[PDB]
Design a protein around this ligand. Structure first.
Ligand SMILES: *CCC(=O)Nc1nc2c(s1)COCC2
Ligand SMILES: *CCC(=O)Nc1nc2c(s1)COCC2
Length: 334
């Protein structure tokens, strides 16, 4: 079995000529030559007690089939549960991600427009399956050499459950802080589609300036960053927050005026800013939906609902989780 950087990376004979890429949220990732398809591919090593997030991501990615969502090409593991330790996930090799790209590259308006279109196209499919991604951010958006975009990391995804979204003030949240909608800090468990639209809005703003729009240092600092740009919520939007502790927190804050988008983003396309304003709406009920965003004038060059597919239908102890991973990966065995 082959070795990479003082670590076992055992991908059968099918995958050779391993080259270390880096470390992802799961473990070691390499490129390798697929001797069947005659192309370089990416392979992620998953090592265990396994994570719930691994099972969730495998189930989702195997069910989904969309141009703007990363697929699983192959899964490598031992033939029995007793022998199953590591699991290797094989996927298309991508050139980069939008986190790395924004660290070093200015995007043209054309690239911003095209990336936003593809994010929203993928997200339409995800939401059409009644799934929420819940951790959209630049590092979860992959690009190939021709700027085709694919969404990854479904580890925090959940089935949408708007009837059970309400929670108390300051409820702990798992997803990446800078991309969290304001309602997460106030009264929301992140079980509605509007949670993802907020993240997309944050990503758009970050594409416009190469800097995160709301870089909060801690949980409640994230809300002051948001309010520092959007300004204080209106009486009507505050009245929508029925929880008293959340309401009264907002009432306790000094009045903050709105920072106009054209002042934050003086070189931005005006239609991009109109769409940004609609995605970064404080009140999640007033926030634009994925299909509306696709139909916005900014994306007129790309919008084509007949070419924006939707999903065919809507979507434990450690021993049971290991067993379900084994069962879920069975289709890749000969
Ligand atoms: C969702 C994060 C993720 O899986 N990132 C990846 N980045 C690359 C991958 S997967 C494969 O191609 C190299 C870059
Ligand atoms: C107070 C809660 C709230 O703002 N509800 C809303 N419901 C709708 C809105 S705002 C706008 O779109 C129609 C439904």
């Amino acid at each position: 079995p082959e070795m990479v950087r003082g670590q076992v990376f055992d991908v059968g004979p099918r995958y050779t000529n391993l080259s270390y890429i880096g470390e992802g949220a799961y473990g070691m990732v390499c490129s390798a030559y697929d001797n069947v398809n005659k192309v370089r591919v990416a392979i992620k090593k998953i090592s265990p007690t396994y994570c719930q997030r691994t099972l969730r991501e495998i189930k989702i990615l195997l069910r989904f089939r969309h141009e703007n969502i990363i697929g699983i090409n192959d899964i490598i593991r031992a033939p029995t549960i007793e022998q199953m330790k590591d699991v290797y996930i094989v996927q298309d090799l991508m050139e980069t991600d939008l986190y790395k790209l924004l660290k070093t590259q200015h995007l043209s308006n054309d690239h911003i427009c095209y990336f936003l279109y593809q994010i929203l196209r993928g997200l339409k499919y995800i939401h059409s399956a009644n799934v929420l991604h819940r951790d959209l951010k630049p590092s979860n958006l992959l690009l190939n050499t021709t700027c085709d975009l694919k969404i990854c990391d479904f580890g925090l995804a959940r089935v949408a459950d708007p009837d059970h979204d309400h929670t108390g003030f300051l409820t702990e949240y798992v997803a990446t802080r800078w991309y969290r909608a304001p309602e997460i800090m106030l009264n929301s468990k992140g079980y509605t589609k509007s949670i993802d639209i907020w993240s997309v809005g944050c990503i758009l703003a970050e594409m416009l300036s190469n800097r995160p729009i709301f870089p909060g240092k801690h949980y409640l600092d994230q809300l002051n960053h948001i309010l520092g740009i959007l300004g204080s919520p209106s009486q009507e939007d505050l009245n929508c927050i029925i929880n008293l502790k959340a309401r009264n927190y907002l009432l306790s804050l000094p009045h903050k005026n709105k920072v106009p988008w054209n002042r934050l983003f003086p070189n931005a396309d005006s239609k991009a800013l109109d769409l940004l304003d609609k995605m970064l709406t404080f009140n999640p009920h007033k926030r634009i939906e994925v299909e509306q965003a696709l139909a916005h004038p900014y994306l007129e060059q790309y919008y084509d609902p007949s070419d924006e597919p939707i999903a065919e239908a809507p979507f434990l102890p450690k021993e049971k989780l290991k067993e379900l991973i084994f069962e879920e990966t069975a289709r890749f065995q000969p």
